[PDB]
Symmetry: C5
Subunit: 274 residues, 5 copies
């Protein structure tokens, strides 16, 4: 009786994980939080070369990095504590004492981080006809709701497929909403900045779009092949890779590109340019 | 025989916690201390854009963040160490070896932090009819007493409902006193600063009022449906720990940010705070 | 229970056990201890810019103390929690041999590094009149070391051998009064030739120095201050560890703050502190 | 036990066991590893003020690498110690299943982050002549990724399947030479247009780059470089882990230092480095 | 069968450690790494007050402090992990699970740190007759070899007294060489700086000499009294105190004195006075 548990635990409690599956997941999750703390240094070290008006972008990035490090660290330790090598069969199996594995650390990370990442672009670019205050509140409300609904759903990703998908769908509503507003902001952002600045905002959009889509991909990962191929250790590896790739892109790379824009806009483009 | 223990331990020792209840509490408590360390960075990184006379506000915020991180971290680890998964029934139960769970880490955090948060506003605003030193001492005395009395009470929140509520009440006395003085401060603060600065102080009050009220809510959370119903159970534990987390974040970080923003605007450097 | 040359906490823990309140409180207060130290560090780092160059070593030495103190007081807190385990049957915490015996030695060795600095550091802020920098320092340093080293030896015996306990205690006290004597000299010579604002602070410093430093020998004797009386119990343990914590905070952080404030005023940057 | 697709360390540890010297040394050297990384970080942070704006991203990227490397090399060190337990009966360290299997994957995934940055970062110090920044970078980035990813896969098989081991190894080596080729191009074009002092450093960088990068494939093959021969033993383990450590220190820290020194000289702040 | 293990483990495996012996060793080793991280703050905080050309001294100190913290921390945890209280007899005994105790963390710390400490003086002072490049390489080569040989020897300090002392001796060769060169450096350093600067370099030498000598003292500590007085828990305490005192002196105090010299040599001597 595992109960309302993530699917990792069900694989780990039956099939077990192979060396490669466990170690890789372990490694990738470690890379996750490593990249976050590393990134922090980039934002701290470049802040002197951002003008005052843009500086909060760098600061908010830095804030995200710290939050993310700590929670993604917790997530990594959740993985390793939760599954123990069985000497007899040569596979890793669920260890009750280390607690059940749960992706909740990541999700709660999103709860802090999502509002900031959406907010923080608004310090770099300027809107035309839209109201800063409105855009922010929309971001913040939709963002919260997207994560909170998703957070509830994923508890059920095995126990109750319907609640899984209901909450998932509702989340997607809130998800799809955010995409709309962000496109609005990038477009109004593009108005009034050099072609150089424009090109960056274009890259940002593609990054934002791809990277944010990854998340619901990883939500569904176990099932994207119906007891098929990804309902296995392969699925676990796949989920945790994608989450890691997503989080790195959506925070660090995202933050870097914003920072680069803010730096160029400050006529300190020499720092970012080679 | 648990004794003078928090009610979490009694739930954990009888009902057990469901996966969702345990994991959520675990997650939210982690979010708690994560946000504190994160916040620290905000205060450090904005300090250059506060004028010298306001800068102690920023510094005191930073101080709080560090204290809070460390003690809230301790609090999170208290939770996780104290309750272990039972594979047979699929619920988390009290682990004696990991020590009893207690909210005391949080409370003693308050003991350091409350004085600073009350103190620190006084470096941004200027009073009219009150003396800096008087307001501070009131804050500091009442603040200490509020926490110390509350701290004693919560040990009894199961063992002895009377002492629970006595100490609770006494605490509440000092609580209202602080509210009273703070309202005085924010009003005198509002006198003589631009409308922009005024509006922030207004938000600060609302935040201060709502967020500080949460705490006694969370104190009583187990019993807010008396002797039964949703709140004397794992649901109550989740509820308490969410509210504490929300409270602590609001009362320290958000509070500190709003003060910081005020101090930054007052320094004629509003450009990084608003854009 | 063949405990040997052990602190009295272990003897209580090994017989009576600690109640929930006693254990948790001690645990909490010891945590507060090291938390306050690291917090304080931030104050000293962040204020250094506002003290003039010639006083700045006071701030630096404070910062140094804070770090040392954090690490050792952290170790001390972990010593407490490791050393006593909840007994499910009776609902009290009892000595756990595996987690090592509890010992206040971490704290004492902290004193060994910290005491010389705290005595030294005032000399950067004040100017002596009649007394010789070199003499005052060496006296502080010699007496300071000896006070701690003798105390450190004594406390091992606070149960095993009451005589050595009190002998070493007394010897320590000799050096204690010496330090008090010299420090009073310093504060008074310090007061000669500095602004009234500076004077007032040095007055406060002395009161704080005096009260806070007296606490220590109080806590040394705490188990016995009521002869098998009231404080030879879990109550005594709580009492000792509260007092040590209060002492250490006052004698380092508050002390350091007051010195900092003095150094800041003497630099004509008093707008920060008011 | 039944180990599967595991590193060879585990097979030694599961049969021969490790001697005190072998275990302790490996333990010590791996600790040195991550210690040096965090230490290095301090150098890059502290010297950045003395590099001109246009070079500064070199120092920043170094700093980023240091942090990533600390965290992952720390993980790697703890992987070693957790995985092998002293057996009091024989006086040798043996594989502990509970501490999880040892795997070098932490290191490899560290490479995945770090390799692109180290190759990238030189381009902020020097200017190319005949080559296109964009092309050189993409080659570095693509080949770098592929080199590590292929290597990462191979090393899982270094015992289980020697053919896959060597295939993947070889494929990796393809991309390796490519990177070497491009880097030589870069260092030469880099040398064009800077003082002889700067030139001399770029020369040293190349020899360091060349030697240090070569070490890695040496360490890949280390168990077999003597066929059930001399290095298929605890000696081989020691040898591998020393070489990896030496490589990583050289290829990141020393490499980074030399680049930093170049950037400092180019900024006419050569007095710092002299 | 402990094998090629440090002597601490043999005491811990037979005699056991008394409360005082264990706790003291535990405490002192903790003080060790605590002082390192503390020191770091001093070097970071004073850096602004040393001129550009001396600044690498402060930086190299800072680097050492961090390395030292981490490895001395590891060393402290090695001690506590390795010996467990026995409730029946009231003594601490060797715990296999916590791994055998070994001073190797410290030694490998030396491997990183020795080159820097020898190097770093050269950023503050200027040589007269001797060649920067040569002095450094001598320091670096001899320094490495001194540690590597010592590191090998100490594994044998119980198992094989001959290898212990051979490797020890070889190490000592390189040791004196470093002492020789350093004296050369301090003297050439003294040429062309004020008497104030001179006096500091004099203190540095005394400190350098005393503190560095301590190390081989601690190497031999178990035997310095032949089944004698120091082949006991007393010897363990003695070794670990001396190592701690040595490391603090040879890095932190050393670094401070150099920093003070660098600060003095710059306009702003007021900070250190
Ligand atoms: C410090 C003050 C302690 C007061 C304890 C208390 O109020 O409770 C008494 C009653 O015995 C609770 O069971
Ligand atoms: C730094 C973290 C970020 C940017 C997280 C973003 C998370 C999402 C976009 C999540 C989206 C989800 C859905 C659209 C459906 C399933 C539930 C979620 C929350 C994973
Ligand atoms: C950062 C922490 C803060 C601002 C803590 C505030 C705590 C309170 C306002 C506590 C109030 C209480 C009562 C009014 C009654 C019950 C006992 C307390 C202490 C929880
Ligand atoms: C930061 C730590 C400080 C300022 C420690 C001060 C410690 C003392 C003044 C200790 C005094 C003692 C006696 C006077 C008798 C008993 C032994 C001592 C060392 C506790
Ligand atoms: C900081 C880490 C660096 C610079 C890592 C470099 C790694 C390599 C050059 C690895 C090369 C390999 C081969 C050429 C064959 C075997 C597989 C590899 C990846 C170890
Ligand atoms: C910061 C660490 C330092 C300065 C270490 C210095 C170490 C030595 C001078 C060691 C000397 C030794 C001998 C001369 C003989 C025995 C082996 C050694 C390495 C301990
Ligand atoms: C042009 C600016 C380049 C700066 C790159 C810094 C990025 C650091 C984040 C960590 C790297 C993760 C890549 C997988
Ligand atoms: C191990 C994690 C280290 C990250 C914190 C280091 C950031 C401090 C450097 C800031 C210095 C600013 C110089 C401009
Ligand atoms: C949830 C709260 C997360 C912590 C917030 C810390 C930094 C927030 C800064 C916001 C900037 C406001 C200026 C407008
Ligand atoms: C691990 C979290 C560290 C955050 C605090 C470090 C901030 C230092 C940056 C100061 C630069 C201005
Ligand atoms: C309430 C317990 C105190 C511990 C907090 C330590 C943090 C430093 C306090 C700074 C106070 C600054 C006030 C100076 C103005 C006079
Ligand atoms: C783990 C928490 C570490 C926080 C300690 C504080 C470190 C000081 C950095 C502040 C830099 C201020 C620069 C202005
Ligand atoms: C808990 C670890 C504390 C180590 C100190 C880290 C260095 C802090 C940097 C302070 C910079 C302040 C300069 C103004
Ligand atoms: C110019 C000299 C630079 C000093 C190098 C400091 C980098 C620290 C890394 C330690 C390397 C181990 C030997
Ligand atoms: C274990 C702690 C080591 C991390 C080093 C953090 C770097 C802090 C440097 C602060 C720079 C201040 C600039 C003057
Ligand atoms: C007990 C040793 C601990 C070392 C901590 C850092 C030492 C700072 C010393 C400051 C004195 C320098 C100026 C006085 C001459
Ligand atoms: Na595991
Ligand atoms: Na748990
Ligand atoms: Na305990
Ligand atoms: Na081990
Ligand atoms: Na132990």
């Amino acid at each position: 009786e595992l109960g309302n548990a993530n699917f990792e635990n069900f694989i780990g409690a039956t099939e077990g994980f192979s060396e490669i599956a466990y170690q890789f997941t372990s490694h990738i999750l470690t890379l996750g939080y490593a990249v976050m703390l590393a990134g922090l240094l980039y934002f701290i070290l470049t802040i002197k070369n951002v003008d005052k008006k843009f500086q909060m972008s760098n600061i908010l990035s830095a804030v995200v990095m710290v939050s993310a490090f700590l929670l993604l660290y917790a997530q990594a330790q959740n993985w390793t504590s939760s599954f123990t090598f069985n000497e007899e069969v040569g596979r890793y199996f669920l260890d009750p004492s280390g607690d059940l594995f749960n992706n909740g650390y990541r999700y709660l990370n999103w709860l802090i981080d999502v509002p900031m990442l959406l907010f923080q672009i608004l310090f770099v670019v300027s809107l035309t006809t839209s109201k800063f205050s409105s855009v922010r509140n929309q971001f913040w409300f939709s963002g919260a709701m997207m994560i909170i609904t998703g957070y509830i759903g994923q508890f059920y990703e095995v126990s109750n497929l319907t609640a899984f998908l209901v909450w998932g769908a509702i989340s997607s509503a809130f998800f799809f909403h955010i995409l709309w507003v962000m496109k609005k902001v990038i477009n109004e952002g593009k108005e009034g900045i050099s072609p150089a600045g424009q090109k960056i905002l274009s890259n940002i959009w593609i990054l934002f779009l791809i990277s944010w889509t990854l998340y619901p991909g990883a939500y569904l990962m176990p099932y994207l092949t119906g007891d098929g191929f990804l309902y296995s250790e392969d699925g676990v590896m796949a989920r945790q890779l994608v989450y890691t790739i997503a989080d790195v892109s959506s925070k660090v790379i995202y933050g870097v590109l914003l920072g680069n824009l803010a730096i160029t806009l400050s006529k300190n483009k020499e720092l970012v340019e080679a």
